[PDB]
């Protein structure tokens, strides 16, 4: 439920005896956590609302030159001066023009000309600041367990549908607990302050569109700007980067403005994350959490139930959910009520030996009516297998062939881990970690490598990384010396970081 | 007498859009409004499943169409060399004053 | 060439003008334009392979004014375009030029 | 229970065709019948005289 169709579903198995398991909840990826005697709980980060943002220096992109004026001075008669030069809402530039007897002057030479124009911004973009004490991570928890009606509407996040519950994560209250009816309660230990480093991120608001703009990029835009806390007519410091003073032949100095820079600033957001806004709060479409799953109060619902008798019905002919797992729907035709479904994966049907492990642990028929539905998930081994979902003689089966190999899934998990390391970095060592002296020393040397990598290069694009990586690959392919490993590991750590997009 | 050349658009506006989906390994997505040249289009792959209406899990086919509409465009004109009209002012030195 | 953009003109070189990545029609249209190459202003971005967004970029007037680095500008007083630059090559036959 | 995929054509036909030229250094040629997807077209350069 709610994580069975998304292609970025990861399986986090293996705990420290079932106490806690450190996981990273990505924004688009889904996390499936399976246990020994506890039901499988699917986690997915949905929204990230940032509330009560204060504003920072808000730039202008489309200006408008108002009623201008100009005044000239004769050469060796002083310099030019206007009454509207000392105003801060007027732009001004002095120049030296040719002045002669034909222009009314009486001394040939280089004169002095000042053209003044009133700067009037039409449409400005507003950059806001995001505080780390304002993040509200919503977490939708949904166990696999005893699935109801195959798939229910996921908008019922209320007190009904007790297999699902919502979790709101604040840094003011970083621990939370979702009461699952019958299943106990899962405890969360999220660390939202160690998230997507929001002290160096801003929030741009430009023409009913929003972004996640980096701070060092935002403090370096050559555009007119002001303080931020004024909605009226601002002061507009640095006006000279939008108007252009052009004198044709030192006779007439017409100041013309540049165009609307909205297209020039949409092209300058080469790495921003587009966010949305559902009111006063800005919902992000990205990020990653850092959650430890305290599972001591997570107990398995329906262990005391008996098995089923007979008369299953095979509706919704199953398929592979892009990972080797087979999501199977069944319809138990029987009024026994709370019975336990005998599902196992078995080659050599005379023996019925369980060869493939089961994802939805302890499947439970819930409804006590005639036709009670159920939705399971099984992981067959590579090769041929049968989905035997009954007992006795009235059982129904289904042949399934999971194409692939064990080393193919090993290479797929290695590629997935390499992409997870390139996306997250230091947090990638605690995605399936159980704690110890092996998932913390590697995380420590990766934190040292991240401090020696993110601070070293730190400003390269997609193309420039491959451009210096070809140079480092040439330095590793030649130049026979002792320092030959420093130019090959820094090739792979750049190309994997900027190739797996 | 300048002749016009290719005229670019610099300010656009997206009209009413739509996006057709397709079940995986059940064909490809196709819009009935894809047969007009004023509709831009792009094909992509999305995830489909039992919650999304299909009975086959896998990468589906999504085609999104959007009607393109340019409000303000710029126009390039060409220059014929046989139509230049240079104006040359001459001025001899003689009985003239500074106000001439 | 001779650009025309919101009562402004420029002397734009041909090899710069035929390499602009912007949607254009052929200039010979006097109605609704065909707009060849519309994929340079709209941006198709799938969110999480479950929802595909389509958004246009901003008005490219500032991005094309900043791209006209070395183009001289010109005026236009109607159907004729007066230039603010150029150079001639004139031979001054001073045979009939007598002293008054 | 077979669902269709991309279906190809093997016997085509050409309806009433059209062609039009533009003068050199006078722009590129264009038709109003190019604005439909049921028309194929190709731009080329031919000699043009008085």
């Amino acid at each position: 439920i709610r994580c069975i169709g998304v292609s970025n579903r990861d399986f986090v198995e293996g705990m420290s005896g079932g106490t806690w398991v450190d996981v990273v909840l990505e924004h688009g990826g889904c996390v499936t956590v399976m246990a020994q005697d506890k039901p499988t709980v699917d986690i997915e980060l949905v929204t990230t609302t940032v509330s009560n943002m204060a504003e920072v220096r808000s730039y202008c992109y489309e200006a408008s030159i108002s009623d201008m004026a100009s005044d000239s001075r004769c050469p060796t008669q002083g310099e030019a001066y206007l009454d509207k030069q000392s105003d801060t809402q007027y732009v001004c530039k002095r120049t030296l023009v040719d002045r002669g007897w034909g222009n009314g002057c009486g001394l040939f030479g280089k004169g002095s000309l000042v053209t003044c124009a009133k700067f009037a911004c039409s449409k400005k973009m507003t950059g806001k600041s995001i505080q780390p004490e304002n993040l509200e991570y919503r977490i939708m928890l949904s166990v696999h367990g005893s699935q109801h009606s195959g798939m229910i509407v996921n908008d019922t996040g209320h007190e009904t549908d007790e297999n699902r519950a919502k979790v709101e994560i604040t840094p003011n209250s970083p621990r939370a607990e979702a009461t699952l009816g019958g299943f106990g309660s899962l405890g969360l230990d999220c660390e939202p302050r160690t998230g997507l480093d929001f002290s160096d991120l801003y929030y741009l608001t430009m023409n009913n569109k929003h972004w996640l703009v980096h701070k060092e990029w935002f403090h370096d835009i050559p555009l007119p700007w002001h303080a931020g806390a004024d909605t009226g007519t601002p002061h507009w410091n640095n006006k000279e980067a939008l108007v252009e003073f052009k004198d044709a032949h030192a006779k007439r100095q017409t100041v013309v403005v540049l165009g609307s820079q909205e297209g020039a600033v949409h092209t300058a957001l080469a790495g921003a994350l587009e966010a949305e806004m559902d009111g006063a709060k800005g919902r992000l479409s990205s990020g990653h959490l850092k959650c430890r799953l305290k599972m001591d109060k997570l107990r398995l619902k329906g262990v005391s139930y008996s098995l089923c008798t007979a008369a299953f019905t095979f509706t919704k002919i199953p398929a592979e959910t892009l990972h080797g797992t087979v999501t199977v729907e069944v319809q138990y035709a029987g009024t026994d009520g709370p019975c336990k479904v005998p599902a196992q994966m078995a080659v050599d049907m005379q023996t019925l030996t369980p060869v493939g492990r089961l994802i939805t642990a302890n499947p439970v028929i819930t409804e006590s009516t005639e036709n009670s539905k159920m939705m399971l998930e099984l992981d067959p081994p590579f090769g041929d297998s049968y989905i035997v979902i009954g007992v006795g003689e009235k059982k129904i089966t289904h042949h399934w062939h999971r194409s692939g190999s064990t080393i193919g899934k090993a290479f797929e998990a290695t590629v997935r881990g390499a992409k997870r390391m390139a996306v997250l970095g230091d947090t990638a060592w605690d995605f399936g970690s159980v704690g110890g002296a092996l998932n913390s020393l590697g995380k420590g040397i990766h934190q040292i490598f991240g401090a020696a990598f993110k601070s070293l290069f730190g400003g390269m694009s997609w193309f420039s990384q491959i451009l210096i990586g070809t140079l480092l690959m040439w330095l590793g392919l030649n130049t026979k010396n002792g320092s030959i490993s420093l130019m090959c590991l820094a090739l792979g750590g750049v190309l994997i970081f900027l190739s797996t997009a | 007498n300048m002749a016009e050349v290719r005229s670019y658009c610099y300010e656009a506006s997206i009209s009413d859009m739509a996006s057709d989906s397709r079940c995986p390994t059940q064909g490809e997505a196709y819009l009935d409004k894809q047969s007009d040249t004023q509709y831009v289009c792009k094909r992509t792959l999305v995830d489909r499943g039992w919650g999304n209406g299909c009975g086959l899990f896998g990468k589906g086919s999504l085609v999104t169409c959007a009607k393109f509409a340019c409000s303000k465009k710029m126009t390039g004109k060409s220059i014929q060399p046989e139509n230049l009209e240079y104006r040359i002012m001459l001025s001899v030195h003689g009985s003239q004053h500074s106000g001439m | 060439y001779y650009l025309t953009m919101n009562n402004k003109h420029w002397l734009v070189h041909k090899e710069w003008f035929h390499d602009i990545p912007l949607p254009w029609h052929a200039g010979a249209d006097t109605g609704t334009p065909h707009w060849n190459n519309k994929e340079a202003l709209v941006e198709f971005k799938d969110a999480h392979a479950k929802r595909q967004t389509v958004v246009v970029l901003g008005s490219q007037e500032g991005a094309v004014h900043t791209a006209l680095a070395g183009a001289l500008e010109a005026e236009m007083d109607g159907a004729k375009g007066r230039l603010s630059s150029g150079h001639l090559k004139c031979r001054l036959k001073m045979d009939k030029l007598r002293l008054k | 229970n077979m669902a269709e995929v991309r279906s190809y054509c093997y016997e085509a036909s050409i309806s009433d065709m059209a062609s039009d030229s533009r003068c050199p250094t006078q722009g590129e040629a264009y038709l109003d019948k190019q604005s439909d997807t049921q028309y194929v077209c190709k731009r080329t350069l031919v000699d043009r005289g008085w």
Partner: antibody, heavy 122, light 109 residues
Framework: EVQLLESGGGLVQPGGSLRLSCAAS????????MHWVRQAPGKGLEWVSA????????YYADSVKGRFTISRDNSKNTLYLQMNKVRAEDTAVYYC???????????????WGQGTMVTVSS | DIVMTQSPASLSLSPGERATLSCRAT??????LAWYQQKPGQAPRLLIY???TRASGIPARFSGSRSGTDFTLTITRLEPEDFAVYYC??????????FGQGTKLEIKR
Amino acid sequence: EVQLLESGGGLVQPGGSLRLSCAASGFSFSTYSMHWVRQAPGKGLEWVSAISGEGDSAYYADSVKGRFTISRDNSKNTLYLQMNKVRAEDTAVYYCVGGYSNFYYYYTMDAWGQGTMVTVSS
Amino acid sequence: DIVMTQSPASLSLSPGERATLSCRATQSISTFLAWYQQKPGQAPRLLIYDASTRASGIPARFSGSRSGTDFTLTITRLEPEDFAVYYCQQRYNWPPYSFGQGTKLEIKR
């Protein structure tokens, strides 16, 4: 509870344009996809058009394509079915169907309105 | 091109017996069907989600089955306050979903 009130009643003259305004309130309609189902007198039900959760996307049926465009205000949770180019085949009872959609157009539990008497008379 | 056809459209039966209504399809719609319940003069409700599970407040006396492209209703006991017009709905691939035709239920008189 389930309260999908409809408005924009009266008659539609041939040649004009009106708006069927469904006053949807009582749920979070920023995620609920909205649909429009007719009810022909003497015949069955007809599917007309629908709006996805995302604002830009909106589909119609092939018999009514390019005529009836809808608009959703996220600050109002309302609909506006623009009844442009109404012919004599639109004499039916329009409804408003709202269901939750993880994808573009889907619903697991459906809601319904009360209907709108829309007939064509000249 | 998927037209939901209903066969039969009317059954002159008594309240208390069974009733089987089937909706057909042309292409390969696997299971995503939805039945409806429409009284004349009232707002239409549903009957079953995916032809197996009803809505909130609908008893388990009415159910359906899946057989290829045909989906037959299974009604245990017919009540006199339940005879109305029923419809089908498509929820496969991309919309517009195709409705059926309308199945009324008549009684002897």
